Design an enzyme around this catalytic site. Structure first.
Site, PDB file in Angstrom:
ATOM      1  N   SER A  29     109.400  44.008   2.189  1.00  0.00           N
ATOM      2  CA  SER A  29     108.615  44.666   1.158  1.00  0.00           C
ATOM      3  C   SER A  29     108.335  46.114   1.579  1.00  0.00           C
ATOM      4  O   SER A  29     107.757  46.916   0.843  1.00  0.00           O
ATOM      5  CB  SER A  29     107.329  43.908   0.885  1.00  0.00           C
ATOM      6  OG  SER A  29     106.621  43.692   2.113  1.00  0.00           O
ATOM      7  N   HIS A  68     111.265  36.504  19.926  1.00  0.00           N
ATOM      8  CA  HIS A  68     111.154  35.095  19.684  1.00  0.00           C
ATOM      9  C   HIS A  68     110.769  34.186  20.805  1.00  0.00           C
ATOM     10  O   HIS A  68     110.622  33.003  20.563  1.00  0.00           O
ATOM     11  CB  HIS A  68     112.493  34.651  19.153  1.00  0.00           C
ATOM     12  CG  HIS A  68     112.804  35.346  17.885  1.00  0.00           C
ATOM     13  ND1 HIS A  68     114.061  35.277  17.280  1.00  0.00           N
ATOM     14  CD2 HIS A  68     112.007  36.106  17.117  1.00  0.00           C
ATOM     15  CE1 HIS A  68     113.987  35.980  16.168  1.00  0.00           C
ATOM     16  NE2 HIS A  68     112.759  36.495  16.048  1.00  0.00           N
ATOM     17  N   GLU A 113     119.228  36.995  20.088  1.00  0.00           N
ATOM     18  CA  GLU A 113     119.983  35.821  19.700  1.00  0.00           C
ATOM     19  C   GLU A 113     121.222  35.549  20.531  1.00  0.00           C
ATOM     20  O   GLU A 113     121.988  36.463  20.861  1.00  0.00           O
ATOM     21  CB  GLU A 113     120.445  35.935  18.239  1.00  0.00           C
ATOM     22  CG  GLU A 113     119.360  36.540  17.260  1.00  0.00           C
ATOM     23  CD  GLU A 113     120.001  36.754  15.900  1.00  0.00           C
ATOM     24  OE1 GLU A 113     121.161  36.502  15.676  1.00  0.00           O
ATOM     25  OE2 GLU A 113     119.226  37.258  14.986  1.00  0.00           O
ATOM     26  N   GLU A 132     115.155  29.793  12.837  1.00  0.00           N
ATOM     27  CA  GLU A 132     116.564  29.615  12.571  1.00  0.00           C
ATOM     28  C   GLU A 132     117.191  28.373  13.143  1.00  0.00           C
ATOM     29  O   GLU A 132     118.403  28.196  12.993  1.00  0.00           O
ATOM     30  CB  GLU A 132     117.405  30.906  12.821  1.00  0.00           C
ATOM     31  CG  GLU A 132     116.777  32.105  12.067  1.00  0.00           C
ATOM     32  CD  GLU A 132     117.436  33.385  12.478  1.00  0.00           C
ATOM     33  OE1 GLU A 132     118.283  33.406  13.356  1.00  0.00           O
ATOM     34  OE2 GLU A 132     117.035  34.429  11.779  1.00  0.00           O
ATOM     35  N   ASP A 144     123.064  39.020  19.913  1.00  0.00           N
ATOM     36  CA  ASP A 144     122.346  39.910  19.060  1.00  0.00           C
ATOM     37  C   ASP A 144     121.312  40.490  19.977  1.00  0.00           C
ATOM     38  O   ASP A 144     120.320  39.845  20.309  1.00  0.00           O
ATOM     39  CB  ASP A 144     121.756  39.413  17.754  1.00  0.00           C
ATOM     40  CG  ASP A 144     120.954  40.460  16.990  1.00  0.00           C
ATOM     41  OD1 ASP A 144     120.990  41.721  17.470  1.00  0.00           O
ATOM     42  OD2 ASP A 144     120.380  40.172  15.971  1.00  0.00           O
ATOM     43  N   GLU A 170     125.815  42.308  18.739  1.00  0.00           N
ATOM     44  CA  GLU A 170     125.147  42.939  17.614  1.00  0.00           C
ATOM     45  C   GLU A 170     124.012  43.848  18.066  1.00  0.00           C
ATOM     46  O   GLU A 170     123.274  43.504  19.010  1.00  0.00           O
ATOM     47  CB  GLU A 170     124.528  41.775  16.787  1.00  0.00           C
ATOM     48  CG  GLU A 170     123.715  42.262  15.582  1.00  0.00           C
ATOM     49  CD  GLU A 170     123.275  41.124  14.634  1.00  0.00           C
ATOM     50  OE1 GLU A 170     124.077  40.164  14.581  1.00  0.00           O
ATOM     51  OE2 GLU A 170     122.271  41.127  13.984  1.00  0.00           O
ATOM     52  N   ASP A 198     123.666  45.851  12.511  1.00  0.00           N
ATOM     53  CA  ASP A 198     122.567  45.186  11.760  1.00  0.00           C
ATOM     54  C   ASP A 198     121.461  46.188  11.357  1.00  0.00           C
ATOM     55  O   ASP A 198     121.490  46.729  10.282  1.00  0.00           O
ATOM     56  CB  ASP A 198     122.059  43.843  12.410  1.00  0.00           C
ATOM     57  CG  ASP A 198     120.915  43.103  11.725  1.00  0.00           C
ATOM     58  OD1 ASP A 198     120.747  43.373  10.465  1.00  0.00           O
ATOM     59  OD2 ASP A 198     120.249  42.275  12.326  1.00  0.00           O
ATOM     60  N   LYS A 212     123.716  41.503   4.479  1.00  0.00           N
ATOM     61  CA  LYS A 212     122.507  40.786   3.962  1.00  0.00           C
ATOM     62  C   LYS A 212     122.386  41.234   2.552  1.00  0.00           C
ATOM     63  O   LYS A 212     121.907  42.336   2.293  1.00  0.00           O
ATOM     64  CB  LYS A 212     121.318  41.213   4.806  1.00  0.00           C
ATOM     65  CG  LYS A 212     121.329  40.522   6.145  1.00  0.00           C
ATOM     66  CD  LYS A 212     120.417  41.185   7.150  1.00  0.00           C
ATOM     67  CE  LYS A 212     120.188  40.294   8.314  1.00  0.00           C
ATOM     68  NZ  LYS A 212     119.450  41.014   9.352  1.00  0.00           N
ATOM     69  N   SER A 247     125.555  37.164   6.460  1.00  0.00           N
ATOM     70  CA  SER A 247     124.419  36.579   7.170  1.00  0.00           C
ATOM     71  C   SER A 247     123.242  35.996   6.357  1.00  0.00           C
ATOM     72  O   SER A 247     122.944  36.438   5.252  1.00  0.00           O
ATOM     73  CB  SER A 247     123.833  37.763   8.030  1.00  0.00           C
ATOM     74  OG  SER A 247     122.589  37.460   8.764  1.00  0.00           O
ATOM     75  N   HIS A 248     122.597  34.971   6.918  1.00  0.00           N
ATOM     76  CA  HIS A 248     121.448  34.399   6.277  1.00  0.00           C
ATOM     77  C   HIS A 248     120.267  35.400   6.626  1.00  0.00           C
ATOM     78  O   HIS A 248     120.500  36.427   7.274  1.00  0.00           O
ATOM     79  CB  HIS A 248     121.196  33.057   7.068  1.00  0.00           C
ATOM     80  CG  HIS A 248     120.965  33.260   8.531  1.00  0.00           C
ATOM     81  ND1 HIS A 248     120.444  32.281   9.343  1.00  0.00           N
ATOM     82  CD2 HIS A 248     121.187  34.347   9.331  1.00  0.00           C
ATOM     83  CE1 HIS A 248     120.348  32.759  10.591  1.00  0.00           C
ATOM     84  NE2 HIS A 248     120.780  34.006  10.607  1.00  0.00           N
ATOM     85  N   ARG A 249     119.024  35.079   6.227  1.00  0.00           N
ATOM     86  CA  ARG A 249     117.796  35.837   6.538  1.00  0.00           C
ATOM     87  C   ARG A 249     116.903  34.825   7.325  1.00  0.00           C
ATOM     88  O   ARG A 249     117.211  33.635   7.323  1.00  0.00           O
ATOM     89  CB  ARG A 249     117.023  36.347   5.310  1.00  0.00           C
ATOM     90  CG  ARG A 249     117.857  37.253   4.426  1.00  0.00           C
ATOM     91  CD  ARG A 249     118.353  38.497   5.151  1.00  0.00           C
ATOM     92  NE  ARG A 249     117.337  39.172   5.962  1.00  0.00           N
ATOM     93  CZ  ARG A 249     116.688  40.291   5.505  1.00  0.00           C
ATOM     94  NH1 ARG A 249     116.907  40.760   4.304  1.00  0.00           N
ATOM     95  NH2 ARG A 249     115.788  40.926   6.306  1.00  0.00           N
ATOM     96  N   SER A 250     115.833  35.243   8.000  1.00  0.00           N
ATOM     97  CA  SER A 250     115.026  34.275   8.718  1.00  0.00           C
ATOM     98  C   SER A 250     114.340  33.278   7.771  1.00  0.00           C
ATOM     99  O   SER A 250     114.178  32.125   8.093  1.00  0.00           O
ATOM    100  CB  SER A 250     114.105  34.874   9.735  1.00  0.00           C
ATOM    101  OG  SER A 250     113.405  35.884   9.106  1.00  0.00           O
ATOM    102  N   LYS A 305     127.176  34.046   9.872  1.00  0.00           N
ATOM    103  CA  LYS A 305     126.037  33.854  10.742  1.00  0.00           C
ATOM    104  C   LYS A 305     125.002  33.140   9.844  1.00  0.00           C
ATOM    105  O   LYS A 305     124.458  33.741   8.881  1.00  0.00           O
ATOM    106  CB  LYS A 305     125.464  35.174  11.247  1.00  0.00           C
ATOM    107  CG  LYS A 305     124.306  34.950  12.219  1.00  0.00           C
ATOM    108  CD  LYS A 305     123.290  36.040  12.214  1.00  0.00           C
ATOM    109  CE  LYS A 305     123.606  37.126  13.170  1.00  0.00           C
ATOM    110  NZ  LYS A 305     122.464  38.005  13.479  1.00  0.00           N
TER     111      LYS A 305
HETATM  112 CL   LIG Z   1     116.319  38.387   8.776  1.00  0.00          CL
HETATM  113 MG   LIG Z   2     120.227  41.351  14.235  1.00  0.00          MG
END
Ligand SMILES: [Cl-]
Ligand SMILES: [Mg+2]
Ligand SMILES: [Cl-]
Ligand SMILES: [Mg+2]
Lengths: 436, 436
Positions: B39, B159, B168, B211, B246, B295, B320, B345, B372-375, B396
């Site tokens: 956002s 994380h 990652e 994830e 990543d 990445e 990314d 994305k 790629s997916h998102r979280s 991914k």
């Molecule tokens: Cl994400």
């Molecule tokens: Mg990344």
């Protein structure tokens, strides 16, 4: 008219294979994915596993898939059965298996087809799944009832370090006016809980278990309960959210006694309790916290403990391992007045028809029915339509985290929207949503 | 002909609301759910959040939804656009918003309709989604290419609680002959890693992150790499499984240098590295472990560190945060020879057309594209069909745990089965799947 029956192996929420079935008729292709159940249980229908240590750690389902493709399909297609007649469908599969525990074909093979047929029938009738389900179960559809979701939020017992013996702690947003509202409140609580956990237990404490809840190293039941109370406060929902518990007592039942410190390899037999002592413990918690549901407070075969507690307990008492969705066990439980709510796992029984009858028999006895997920779930939302179709007023489908859980909650939001004025949220009366 | 456009609020895999759109045409109802983005961002399309602290913690998407329902819908329906014409659809939406970052309507309101439209078009043409996407992107369909999945298995950096700075750790089963086989192999290694982690780091270590990967308290990169190597060996897949990393270096970039102990408030500035010093570190690792992809090895604006490393690195280098799926950023990166693979994305840009153009632009410059997916993902499987339609050879999409991940993986298994002889598994040639 079914022109084809096909199955394949797909993955469940935990990364293990499971069966996916496809039924094709003139209206299209209908699919169902089977959640993970049991390969070796005494009372449950058996799920067939390949057992080849060389593939998927021995958890493949190629055998089960082969049963569908090569055994069931030809026969079924040849039989030319009316999918609308769920009973005939199920009788057919049952007969084909010929075992009492679906051990010939595998309960995972049979069920996939059972549920797909239902999907097909609904398309044929041109109605939503939940409506077709209401038809099959002869439930009241004026109005329909949206269930209170029992959200898994925190785990203990075998799911976590720490002494805490009780397995699941859930929240039930009974004070909401709508399902959508119950879901928002529930999500806010969960978020608040997650943050508090990280604060008090450390960031790693935020990682989730199989069902999306957290599992910090908690030592006592009061500790866990206090935590939850704090989350409700933080979210600003005091009085609108109740607690549900899953004791999973069979896990600490030993030699007729209950070892609350079953995590201690050095537990003191002196401290192990008798069922009555244990009952007194629960009564205490019930007096101090807004607990409105308790599952498996006693062992699977400890009938006496259950009956005794039941007499004086005033909240919903849910049977899970005590009944294992088994007709004989349900009948026994009823007669003995061991509990008043049954956790329904479709896959423990194997067919939609039997599942329906189990619920029916339960309602007939004045008991409630909590539709439930399995720890290994899928993206299949069947259960959402099932809880609405059976009008139970209560579902257990995980925390508001992990899509295999959310997918069900999302489907419920969809259903509610579609029903509009024609549906009601069970709210405080979830125990008997069928009689609303 | 589109007769109706509607949006509702549903929940993402993390329990946050997101937008769900539905489009109706004579062929049916077509839906899409938007993954969670940002956002706030300097270069990405803006996702619209309600910001009401009283609901969903300030994360509602009621406004974005009202935008679809009250602004887009009426206008879209009256426009009578042909859904097969993806460009017309996206052009219409872009113009309606009138901002460069979709800040008037919200990228989340826009993307939903863009995607749903593609689904409706596929139905009209009577082809599977991936085929329509192939048509739209002018991809080569003979044969089609199934991608190598880069599975998240272990996480560090932001994380996790150890000192590990890299974010990652993924495994890529390049040595399999089929997607199905790659997935099976991938799952086996994951299970093995989970066991080993629980074994060395404690049961609580088995809990997963957003994830689906584990996040034990790892202190070094070797520590993590060796764990993964051990998992691969335990599973018996030596030589068939590669590693993708990543680094998410922007997270430890400070004052021109790279702080590898950024988690330590006591990081010694005398130990902070320069891009070239950091480049050396990566080279050493690439030497010792089978890393085939890296990445964000350098910060989002550290163009010089990237270009320099790129000169000598012989593995795929993924962009990314450096590009944020932004055309200007992509053009810059291409011109400077900063990397050779773009993380795509769709939600970072807001429309299907733009996303396709971005991949095309990347392929044209000889780069690879990792969808790629998102979280915060959903049960929507759009990305599975997209990776196939763009013929990229690499996706991914999380660990092989949590249905918001598996849903995509399962979708791929289906595509693979359906294509039969007409498709091939990218395998070792994933970098250039488009040219296979
Ligand atoms: Cl994400
Ligand atoms: Mg990344
Ligand atoms: Cl289970
Ligand atoms: Mg239980």
């Amino acid at each position: 008219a079914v022109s084809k029956v096909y199955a394949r192996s797909v993955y469940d929420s935990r990364g293990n294979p499971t069966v996916e079935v496809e039924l094709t008729t003139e209206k299209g292709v209908f699919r169902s994915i089977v959640p993970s159940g049991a390969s070796t249980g005494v009372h449950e229908a058996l799920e067939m596993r390949d057992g080849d240590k060389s593939k998927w750690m021995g958890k493949g389902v190629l055998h089960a898939v082969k049963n569908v493709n090569d055994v069931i399909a030809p026969a079924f297609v040849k039989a030319n059965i009316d999918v609308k007649d769920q009973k005939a469908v199920d009788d057919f599969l049952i007969s084909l298996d010929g075992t009492a525990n679906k051990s010939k074909l595998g309960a995972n093979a049979i069920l996939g087809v059972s549920l797909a047929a239902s999907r097909a029938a609904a398309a044929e009738k041109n109605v939503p799944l939940y409506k077709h389900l209401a038809d099959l179960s002869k439930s009241k559809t004026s109005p329909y009832v949206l269930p209170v979701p029992f959200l898994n939020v925190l785990n203990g017992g075998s799911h976590a370090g720490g002494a805490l013996a009780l397995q699941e702690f859930m929240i039930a947003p009974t004070g909401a006016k709508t399902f959508a509202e119950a879901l928002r409140i529930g999500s806010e609580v969960y978020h608040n809980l997650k943050s508090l956990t990280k604060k008090r237990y450390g960031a790693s404490a935020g990682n989730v278990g199989d069902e999306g809840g957290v599992a910090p190293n908690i030592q006592t039941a009061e500790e866990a309960l206090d935590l939850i109370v704090d989350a409700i406060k933080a979210a600003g929902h005091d009085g609108k959210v109740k607690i549900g518990l899953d004791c999973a007592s069979s896990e600490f039942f030993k030699d007729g006694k209950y070892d609350l410190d079953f995590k201690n390899p050095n537990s003191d037999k002196s401290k192990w309790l008798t069922g009555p002592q244990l009952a007194d413990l629960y009564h205490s918690l019930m007096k101090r916290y807004p607990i409105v549901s308790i599952e498996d407070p006693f062992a699977e075969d400890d009938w006496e403990a259950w009956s005794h507690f039941f007499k004086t307990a005033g909240i919903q008492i849910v049977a899970d391992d005590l009944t294992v969705t088994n007709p004989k066990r349900i009948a026994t439980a009823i007669e003995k007045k061991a509990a008043d709510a049954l956790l329904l796992k479709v896959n423990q029984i194997g067919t939609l028809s039997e599942s329906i009858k189990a619920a029916q028999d339960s309602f007939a006895a004045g008991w409630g029915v909590m539709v439930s997920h399995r720890s290994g779930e899928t993206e299949d939302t069947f259960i959402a339509d099932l809880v609405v179709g059976l009008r139970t007023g209560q579902i257990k489908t995980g925390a508001p985290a992990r899509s295999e859980r959310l997918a069900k909650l999302n489907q419920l939001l969809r259903i509610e929207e579609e029903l509009g004025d024609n549906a009601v949220f069970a709210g405080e009366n979830f125990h008997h949503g069928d009689k609303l």
